[PDB]
Nucleic acid binder design. Structure first.
Ligand code: ZN
Lengths: 98, 75, 50, 230, 85, 139, 233, 50, 49, 50, 13
RNA sequence: GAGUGGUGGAGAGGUA
């Protein structure tokens, strides 16, 4: 399936029950057409090639647009072997580096 | 509903009808551009529609008679 | 069906970061969770932080 | 309000690096508060000079070697990262090390300028083995705080990089170890007062009363946000 | 495009012929130098449609304006490349 | 009007720019394996147009985004002329169908006006750029 | 080294054949960072030979799992060694003992959840001392294949590119020895004749894969007899 | 034998010392075990994994 | 089973056990307190374990 | 060598005897310094009568 | 805050 | 009408 990342897990004790710490790099990759849409909506992007290269240059306006896109938009943290029903849970992601 | 939607569950009665009516309202806000009647506090359309249903300005038959009313005043 | 072959060699330097697996010799594997500062690490009364 | 104020009464130097300092008199209960606060600030936020860019002649990347020397170029960069420099006037200087002949290359062989002081004249860097071998490196010493590494400085550098400017990580903090003790003060009329015995261990480049003064100014200017605004 | 039951049964030879788009008559798959498929081979473009998007083999028709025509020098039908599968 | 060597200079530059921005859409002609190897063995009339190294393209996209925000129709016809390859006869018929000779006239004069606005700011944007020098060695 | 060992470490590092163990005892004549030479004892010398062994060392060569392998000398000049002694340490050897990881101060306590279910919380000074920064040497290859429209060209007059990419390369279309590259930059500028023999329009240069950084320690060029070389070769 | 070695080292014989807390300055209530375990770093690096 | 799956596990459990267990005569036993606010003020000040 | 001064961004006054002084941003490992120093002073040193 | 500032008011710059 | 190939398949080893 498309739109899918993978990483090593770690422990966040500072979170709440509905939050997971997505990395910056994976989130910027996963939400790429959402970033294109917000860039064209905010008048900075006019064409798909300019949006592609503005993401692949990784500007501070792209980091702000990602921080606005992520806001209350859940992601499903699957783990395999997904034996029982609760092996897929959806969390509202918070941005971290790393 | 920004952490737990159980208040919207008690308002509707069922999770699947909650998802369906909130999807109807969020589609009306993203396509039709209708105004969210709760103050938005910089939120997305899905959580805005869940907060609408959670407050109680919209149910399934409320949205149905509202769309039928705008239909008959359009025609 | 080749003409000339050029081979290069890149050499990164991989520092540790949250996610690099670590383990002692006795099967106590782990994954590094936070790189705390020196002041937040616990010390002892002589002054040497763990 | 029956409080008092402390002063630096006796500053003993056990050596050139390891040196304790007293504080007297502190109020009741304040000892661990000031000691832990000065520990956190004195370990995190002190300014010290360190090696940043090393420029050896005839060496392209840091993973090569050179005939005549014994320690490899990564070993030389580590032994240069351990260096302890004290500049006075400028905030960015360039030293020079030139030496030929069989024998080890100490840190005392750097042709120093007037305002730079190399405080470790037995810091070894190289072991020149051939008498026809030479080494001419040009070090660059900035001044900052904290830890700024090579990855973030290659990302953040807007200038170009000629092949030869080898980038060394920056360990800027000259404080390595600090411990405080809350004794019982010898006050002739009070028994409920205490002294704070901070036991620093520096890089040799920082002056302990100056370090304590700077950490105190950092703490006071941080607390001014609580004092003035609400 | 809206089915509601998947019906299965045996296949009459007339049904197999009416599915088909031409008999393959040669075990040669493609050529080895000029990599176009042969005539009546196992990838024969006269049977299994075009290879490029809105083209013929000889390159006479190159445009959507010839929506579906038959190239007289190759026998192929210009469509989109979806009909190849 | 404008001199003709400047005219062919802007023709080549915006042609290269439209060829750059045409290689980014999704609904595009995806080839098979066999057509790919026939093209690599013996090509026909499948040749492409040159693009940029995307920083020159970035700055010229930035200048056309800055000046061409006030006009939607000229931006649309320069896109559909420079990216797809439609003729002025074709876009004139396409805009008249939803007279036609005056439609051709107004699309060519709005193209002339948009080029007259974009040219001198493009010359200044070209001359105020530092060329990044080649890699050097210090000993 | 490990402080708590088993005495099999010298066995593993000697018999694993990766250090430079001496063949005949003597004194060292000249030790370098690249190679160690030794003058043999006259007792342990046969007179038919010349009496000098040479120990070349393999500096910074790629392993089979892309890790680094090098050989720093452990003896200094004017230092007698015997037969069966170690002279140059391998990739993870300290003085002929096996030395795989580093030994570091450990406290056994829960710390605000940050070591929860087999997790490890590491101080800053482990990073600041650079105790755990390994070296990963990665090989990227470029081949000049041969289509039937001409051989592919390794050259720096590539079309459709500018000074945001070509500025690291030389006139020959090949990266210098020592330029620090980042992901997606051109290492070897390869181009292929598109039409028959511009007409070399397709640009098939190498790029660093996204996530790889660092220096270019070596470029090795092979050829077939039939193509004439360039300035870089 | 290990406790004999520790008594030679002028250390607490049980190995447990009394660590402090670098975060809030104060003391951990119970003695904490501190020593030098030989940590590896395995070949499962988070840059190759993500 | 209708028994919750968000149970604390081993470290939260060691902490809550160490909170809610009691010694005999540790430090400042037999005091009388207005409530949790004064009790936590006492513990963070260190006058009662 | 210049430090980040904060702005006191919020006093969420819950009741007349309640507050929550949201405060941002500080240098890495300074929130614990200010918080612990103020907490120990407010616990065991603030003058008053009862 | 002013208690701690007046406590540290001695040895500053 | 405007860049480009592993999946395919085998074998071996590894992680949870
Ligand atoms: Zn044809």
């Amino acid at each position: 399936v498309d739109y899918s990342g993978r990483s090593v897990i770690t422990v966040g004790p500072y979170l709440r029950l509905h939050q997971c710490g997505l990395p910056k790099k994976m989130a910027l990759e996963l939400f790429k057409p959402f970033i294109y849409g917000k860039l064209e909506l905010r008048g900075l992007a006019t064409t798909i090639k300019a949006a592609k290269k503005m993401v692949e240059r990784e500007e501070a306006v792209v980091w702000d647009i990602l921080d606005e896109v992520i806001r209350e938009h859940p992601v499903l943290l699957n783990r395999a072997p997904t034996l029982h029903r609760l092996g897929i849970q959806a969390f509202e992601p918070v941005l971290i580096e790393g | 509903a920004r952490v737990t939607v159980q208040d919207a569950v008690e308002k509707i009665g069922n999770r699947f009808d909650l998802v369906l009516v909130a999807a109807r309202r969020a589609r009306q806000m993203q396509v039709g551009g209708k105004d969210p009647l709760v103050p938005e506090e910089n939120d997305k359309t899905t959580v805005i529609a869940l907060r609408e249903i959670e407050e109680g300005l919209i149910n399934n038959q409320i949205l149905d008679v509202r769309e039928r009313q705008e239909q008959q005043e359009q025609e | 069906g080749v003409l000339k072959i050029v081979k290069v060699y890149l050499a990164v330097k991989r520092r540790i970061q949250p996610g690099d697996k670590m383990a002692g010799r006795h099967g106590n594997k782990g994954v590094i969770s936070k790189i705390n500062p020196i002041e937040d690490m616990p010390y002892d009364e002589n002054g040497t932080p763990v | 309000t029956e409080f008092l104020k402390p002063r630096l009464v006796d500053i003993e130097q056990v050596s050139s690096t390891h040196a304790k300092v007293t504080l007297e008199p502190l109020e009741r209960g304040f000892g661990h508060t000031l000691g832990n606060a000065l520990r956190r600030i004195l370990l995190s936020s002190m300014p010290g000079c360190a090696v940043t860019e090393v420029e050896i002649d005839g060496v392209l990347h840091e993973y090569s070697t050179k005939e005549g020397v014994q320690e490899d170029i990564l070993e030389i960069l580590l032994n240069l990262k351990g260096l302890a420099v004290r500049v006075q006037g400028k905030d960015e200087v360039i030293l020079t090390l030139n030496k030929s002949g069989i024998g080890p290359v100490t840190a005392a062989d750097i042709t120093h300028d007037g305002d730079v002081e190399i405080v470790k004249p037995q810091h070894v860097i190289c072991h020149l083995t051939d008498e026809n071998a030479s080494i001419s490196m040009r070090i660059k010493v900035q001044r900052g705080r904290g830890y700024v590494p090579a990855s973030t400085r290659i990302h953040s550098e807007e200038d170009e990089r000629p092949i030869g400017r080898l980038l060394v990580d920056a360990c800027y903090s000259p404080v390595e170890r600090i411990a405080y003790n809350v004794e019982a003060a010898r006050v002739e009329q009070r028994t409920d007062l205490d002294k704070l015995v901070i036991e620093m261990e520096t890089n040799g480049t920082i002056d302990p009363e100056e370090a304590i003064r700077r950490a105190a100014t950092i703490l006071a200017e941080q607390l001014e946000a609580f004092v003035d605004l609400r | 495009e809206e089915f509601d039951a998947i019906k299965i049964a045996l296949a009459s030879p007339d049904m197999i012929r009416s599915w088909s788009f031409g008999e393959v008559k040669k075990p040669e798959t493609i050529n080895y130098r000029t990599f176009k498929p042969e005539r009546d081979g196992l990838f024969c473009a006269r049977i299994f449609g075009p290879v490029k998007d809105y083209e013929c083999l000889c390159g006479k028709y190159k445009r959507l304006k010839h929506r579906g025509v038959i190239c007289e020098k190759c026998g192929v039908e210009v469509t989109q490349t979806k009909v190849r599968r | 009007n404008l001199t003709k060597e400047q005219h062919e200079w802007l023709n080549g530059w915006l042609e290269l720019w439209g060829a750059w921005v045409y290689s980014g859409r999704l609904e595009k002609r995806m080839s098979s394996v066999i057509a790919k190897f026939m093209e690599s063995v013996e090509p026909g009339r499948v040749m492409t147009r040159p693009m940029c190294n995307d920083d020159d393209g970035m700055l010229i996209s930035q200048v056309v985004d800055s000046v061409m925000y006030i006009d939607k129709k000229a931006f649309g016809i320069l896109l559909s002329y420079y990216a797809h390859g439609s003729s002025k006869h074709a876009i004139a018929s396409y805009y008249h169908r939803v007279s036609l000779a005056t439609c051709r006239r107004e699309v060519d004069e709005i193209l002339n006006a948009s080029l007259f606005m974009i040219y001198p700011v493009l010359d200044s944007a070209f001359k105020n750029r530092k060329r990044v020098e080649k890699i050097k060695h210090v000993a | 080294k490990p402080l708590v060992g088993t005495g099999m470490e010298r066995a593993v590092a000697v018999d694993s054949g990766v250090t430079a163990v001496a063949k005949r005892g003597g004194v060292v004549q000249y030790v370098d960072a690249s190679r160690i030479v030794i003058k043999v004892n006259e007792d342990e010398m046969y007179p038919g030979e010349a009496g000098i062994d040479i120990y070349n060392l393999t500096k910074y060569t790629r392993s089979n799992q892309n890790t680094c392998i090098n050989q720093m000398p452990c003896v200094s000049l004017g230092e007698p060694v015997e037969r069966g002694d170690v002279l140059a340490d391998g990739p993870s050897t300290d003085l002929g003992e096996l030395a795989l990881g580093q030994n570091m101060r450990v406290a056994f306590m829960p710390w605000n959840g940050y070591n929860f279910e087999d997790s490890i919380l590491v101080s800053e000074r482990v990073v600041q001392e650079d105790r755990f920064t390994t070296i990963h040497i990665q090989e990227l290859a470029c081949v000049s294949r041969d289509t039937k429209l001409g051989p592919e060209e390794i050259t720096a007059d590539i079309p459709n590119v500018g000074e945001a990419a070509l500025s690291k390369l030389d006139e020959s279309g090949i990266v210098y020895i020592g330029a620090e590259v980042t992901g997606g930059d051109i290492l070897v500028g390869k181009v292929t004749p598109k039409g028959e023999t511009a007409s070399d329009v397709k640009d098939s240069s190498l790029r660093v894969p996204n996530g790889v950084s660092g220096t270019v320690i070596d470029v090795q060029v092979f050829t077939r007899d039939g193509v004439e070389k360039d300035k870089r070769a | 034998e290990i406790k004999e070695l520790l008594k030679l080292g002028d250390l607490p014989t049980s190995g447990q010392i009394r660590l402090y807390d670098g975060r809030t300055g104060e003391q951990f209530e119970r003695p904490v075990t501190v020593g030098y375990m030989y940590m590896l770093k395995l070949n499962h690096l988070v840059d190759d994994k993500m | 089973n209708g028994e919750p799956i968000i149970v604390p596990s081993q470290d939260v459990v060691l902490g809550l056990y160490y909170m809610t267990r009691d010694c005999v005569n540790a430090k400042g036993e037999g005091m009388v307190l207005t409530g949790p606010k004064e009790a936590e003020r006492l513990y963070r000040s260190g006058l009662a374990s």
